[PDB]
Ligand binder design. Structure first.
Ligand SMILES: *[C@@H](O)[C@H](C[C@@H]1CCNC1=O)NC(=O)[C@H](CC(C)C)NC(=O)OCC(C)(C)Oc1cccc(F)c1
Lengths: 301, 300
């Protein structure tokens, strides 16, 4: 009884618009009198090979941007490039603008993606920022400008805008100031994300979710120290566990009466021994896209 | 590159309200001037062992029902029971009422769940109605009255409202007329869902999703017959495959140039041989909560 869960998307649906420029169309994020979208909307197909964005944007004028909010065209009255995102000022402020902010997330953190096409939402799902600054998403052509987000209190925290796919099938994009996550560039060339690693603190969170849900075959008598556990995790390309990670997991430990280091001994066993064909929360693998926060939010409402 | 994906939840968020009767509080669904919620909101803790709902409801009047859409208190002017759901007529039509219908989904079909607590949405995810009429959700106390739904065009089809958990951890509830999916009753007694079965057509659809996403290690040079494949499906508690299933899968067979019966052969072998430790779309198991429809809509 523990699912991958996304935040309600309603506050965000009313921010999505359609942005066209030439024959390239993608999604924009309409907040106040500004629409944010990926700058590569100004590229033809030839340009994407090795674009000079400054030069390409000079040749553009306000009226080359067809922005549609539903059955309504909005008039573009300005434009700037901020790193890899375009900001088209518009003559209408979005009445559906929520309380919001822009954040740059840390690797290991999760967020919800509102996948859109032609400015219309099709679906929402939960993602993690991988340690190598990619996300394993579900993105097709036209999905660029779709945004990732958290909701905390009344406040929408925008943290991602989608730009590209990499040869491994994973995805890359920017924060809402246009700075990529990771070493990527918005040009059409094969690019390497580097070795991904497993988010150890999230796997321990998911094991606590498993215990909280009456699924505890993997517990043992033993224990370990942070040092000895990291000796093992390195071998399997797990992020090393800090003490801050132990204190993050404190509340989950409190709810289960299982000390973090005791749980680490259980994970050490699972990595060295494998699942043996058993399952954990209906999964035949170890799951690393739940933060401790996500587990608390779900397991206590 | 293929994820479980829920519909956008905005049209439904604006329908969720808080229903209180006594000390019991759960969620209701506000459409036009009617709030729908589970009838066990009128139960105390004692009553839940074996309630006489007709008798329990007599003792209630309109003013025993507190309804709040956010901070807005709605005044209840009428109450009726329809099967296992209460309808509270209220003095205000919901300005955010979407285009909606009520439908009763078939097993093997999927829908999105807007999990709510105290009339406020906390999250959304995708579910399937299992063959044994249960769903594998994430519901805690206070989650009753949360609804499951599909969106086609601008039209919200409401198909589920949540009522209870079974001892196995799976979940049971009603359509929006209050008729349970499955043999269940809204009383706090042990209740059996019976042997679950695997939604064969959905597994085939997911294997097609896999091939569309560059993952074909499981394909083979063998083939098989409908009748031959089903002999093996019985063994493993799989719904049998009809030719309707074959035709529903027609669009996916096209897109990949793999014939359904060839895929049935690859599936037969996975059932017989196992996954040999490998994976398909990042799962070490066979997934059966994607309809052919879901796979199409995602991959195109
Ligand atoms: C909605 O508010 C809750 C949700 C329930 C609580 C835990 N997880 C859930 O999904 N529903 C209930 O409290 C019902 C109300 C009755 C009038 C049906 N009770 C309930 O779900 O009890 C669950 C347990 C304790 C397992 O008992 C039952 C109840 C019904 C059938 C069973 F097989 C077992």
């Amino acid at each position: 009884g523990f699912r991958k869960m996304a935040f309600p998307s309603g506050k965000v649906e009313g921010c999505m618009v359609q942005v066209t420029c030439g024959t390239t169309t993608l999604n924009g994020l309409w907040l106040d009198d500004v629409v944010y979208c990926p700058r590569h909307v100004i590229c033809t197909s030839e340009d994407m090979l090795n674009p000079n964005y400054e030069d390409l944007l000079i040749r553009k004028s306000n009226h080359n941007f067809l922005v549609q909010a539903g059955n309504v065209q909005l008039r573009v009255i300005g434009h700037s490039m901020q790193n890899c995102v375009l900001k088209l000022k518009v003559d209408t402020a979005n009445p559906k603008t929520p309380k919001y902010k822009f954040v740059r997330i840390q690797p290991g953190q999760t967020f919800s993606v509102l996948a859109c096409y032609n400015g219309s939402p099709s679906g929402v799902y939960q993602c993690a920022m991988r340690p190598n600054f990619t996300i394993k998403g579900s993105f097709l052509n036209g999905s660029c400008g779709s945004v990732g987000f958290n909701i905390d209190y009344d406040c929408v925290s925008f943290c991602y805008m989608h730009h590209m796919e990499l040869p491994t099938g994973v995805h890359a994009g920017t924060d809402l100031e246009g700075n990529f996550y990771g070493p990527f560039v918005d040009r059409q060339t094969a690019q390497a994300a580097g070795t991904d690693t497993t988010i150890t603190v999230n796997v321990l969170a998911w094991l606590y979710a498993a215990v909280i849900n009456g699924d505890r075959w993997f517990l043992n008598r033993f224990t370990t120290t942070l040092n000895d556990f990291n000796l093992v995790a390195m071998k399997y390309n797990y992020e090393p566990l800090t003490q801050d990670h132990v204190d993050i997991l404190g509340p989950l430990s409190a709810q289960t009466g299982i000390a973090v280091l005791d749980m680490c001994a259980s994970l050490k066993e699972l990595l060295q021994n494998g699942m043996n064909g058993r399952t954990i929360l209906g999964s035949a693998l170890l799951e690393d896209e739940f933060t401790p926060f996500d587990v608390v939010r779900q397991c206590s409402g």
